Amino acid sequence: HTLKTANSYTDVTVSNSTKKAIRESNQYTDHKFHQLDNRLDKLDTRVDKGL
Amino acid sequence: SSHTLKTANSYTDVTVSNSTKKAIRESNQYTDHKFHQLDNRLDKLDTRVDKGLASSA
Amino acid sequence: TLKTANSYTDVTVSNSTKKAIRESNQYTDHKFHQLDNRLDKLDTRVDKGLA
């Protein structure tokens, strides 16, 4: 009985799923990081003049 | 089984989809949490700079 | 034995969930850190430019 074919479909689907998750989380992460990059750039410029 | 690879395969698709969404929800929760600690630190540095500034005479 | 295929699915999906979370969370930490090291560098500046 083709548990093998069921199990092997699972493996393929899971591993693409994992991929997807990681990339989607990291793009959210990159977005959040850029938020904060743009604040830090605007503060760093402040300090350089307030100097 | 033969063709109830279809029922197994279709259970695989349903479960994988719910899994992908959960992993993403949890990850992004953890991101927001860490972003927030950084936000809080920038807020208080921003306030410092606004005072360490206004002071002149 | 949909049951045996289905229960291999459950075991594999649940392992891939946590894997995707582990990797996301490490990318997040990595970014955090970059940002922390920028903050500490700016903090120190302000504490001296507080001359």
Neighbours of chain C (3+ CB pairs under 8 A): A, B
Q: How far apart are CA C15 and CA A5, in angstroms?
A: 20
In chain A, DSSP assigns E strands to none
For domain B1-57, the CATH class is mainly alpha
- A2 three-state secondary structure: coil
Experimental technique for the deposited model = X-ray
Resolution for this PDB entry, in angstroms:
2.0
CA-angle at C19, arms to C18 and C23, nearest 5°: 115
| Structural contact between residues B30 and C25, judged by C-beta atoms closer than 8 angstroms | yes
Domain ranges of chain C: 1-51
A1-51 is a CATH 2.40.110.10 domain? no
How many residues in chain B? 57
Most B CBs within 10 Å: which of C6, C11, C21, C23, as the mutation test of the B interface?
C21
Any B CB within 8 A of C38 CB: no
Q: How far apart are CA C9 and CA C48, in angstroms?
A: 58
Distances (CA, A) of B51 to A29, A50, B57, C13: 32, 11, 13, 53
Tokens 């690879």 correspond to B5
